[PDB]
Design a protein around this ligand. Structure first.
Ligand SMILES: COC(=O)c1c(C)n[nH]c1-c1ccco1
Ligand SMILES: COC(=O)c1c(C)n[nH]c1-c1ccco1
Lengths: 208, 208
């Protein structure tokens, strides 16, 4: 069964700004999603120190970047803490409301889209490059879920029956037709080297 | 009763580097401690979304900066999640080991002390300016504790009987005699404005 939800007005407004504003420095989306993965990995690693069985769903803590020219997707996979259904439907949205409002205020005052990550809503920078984002995620206390949104003010969530991921989050960027440079090996390597050089987890860029 | 502990060799080595290296841009300590406070506040705010009673120990989420010329202290207080005794003695040290090692590697390779926060050990930048750091902290699942260290390879922890804080962390910087500019109103305001302008919690700078 697929459930369809309305984003809060403020988050929809943010997504439309990210989609509609002229802003050429789009490559920052990748830094933001890797940053999110690094935070999710810190969180599982911290929780494991007190409950080692939290890693029974997989010990390795890493980030993979997987381009696929045939599907026109760039996937960012981590083995971090994952997201529950409540995170997907409620918690992230309530955190995203006040971050959005601060970000909007900063932007009126001359801040730049590249600062989005300071307001805790850097995930939505995926819409610089993706016409659709699919997120597959699995938290230890919950089932594997697929969330998806092409913006336009709604998102879906369903229980995912695809390949079991163990634990973590996969963000699948369905790239806009003019953004396929982000499938290119040397372009991805360039961006990781520039913005993500000191991330404390191995980042493997897959080759096609 | 006061318990005295040895830092791991790697953390002691880091503290000695921070104390001994010539590095004039000391003001970054403040950005790092405010960043830590903002992360602790995000964590309590996130946990409250699923268990609202986590805020019974205080609803306001804020950061106060309190200079005291008579004591020569600058205190950074937050009402974030706080730290347990296990965090103080074990968990932070195990996180700090691999961050230290990456940071040391980056520094050999030409990275700068100001990047310390990327390796999750920005707390130790307090030793740029403080000859002693005292941290009073209170987590919902645990007692109020006072941790303290003047570096030299050891730290102490005791149960704190001072004024109850409700929930959060107070970092008290016993400033080096030549670092008292950090007690000055206009100097603190300058640094917050430069480095901490978009923190998503109210930061109140107390006046003397
Ligand atoms: C559907 O996924 C998300 O919304 C998401 C992921 C995968 N990481 N961070 C976020 C997020 C959303 C809002 C603030 O953070
Ligand atoms: C005694 O306090 C600490 O060590 C501390 C505080 C107060 N914030 N972050 C830290 C920390 C230490 C190591 C990595 O992070």
């Amino acid at each position: 069964e697929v459930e369809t939800f309305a984003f809060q007005a403020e988050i929809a407004q943010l997504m439309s700004l990210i989609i509609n504003t002229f802003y050429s420095n789009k490559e920052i989306f990748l830094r933001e999603l890797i940053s999110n993965s690094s935070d999710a990995l810190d969180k599982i690693r911290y929780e494991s120190l007190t409950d080692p069985s939290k890693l029974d769903s997989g010990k390795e803590l890493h980030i993979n970047l997987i381009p696929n020219k045939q599907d026109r997707t760039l996937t960012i996979v981590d083995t971090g803490i994952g997201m529950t259904k409540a995170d997907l439907i409620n918690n992230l949205g309530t955190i995203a409301k006040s971050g959005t409002k601060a970000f909007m205020e900063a932007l009126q005052a001359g801040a730049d889209i590249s600062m989005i990550g300071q307001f805790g809503v850097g995930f939505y920078s995926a819409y610089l490059v993706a016409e659709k984002v699919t997120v597959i995620t699995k938290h230890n206390d919950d089932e594997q879920y697929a969330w998806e949104s092409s913006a336009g003010g709604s998102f879906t969530v369903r229980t995912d029956t695809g390949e079991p991921m163990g634990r973590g989050t996969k963000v699948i960027l369905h790239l806009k037709e003019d953004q396929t440079e982000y499938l290119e090996e040397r372009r991805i390597k360039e961006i990781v080297k520039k913005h993500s050089q000191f991330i404390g987890y191995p980042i493997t860029l897959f080759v096609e």
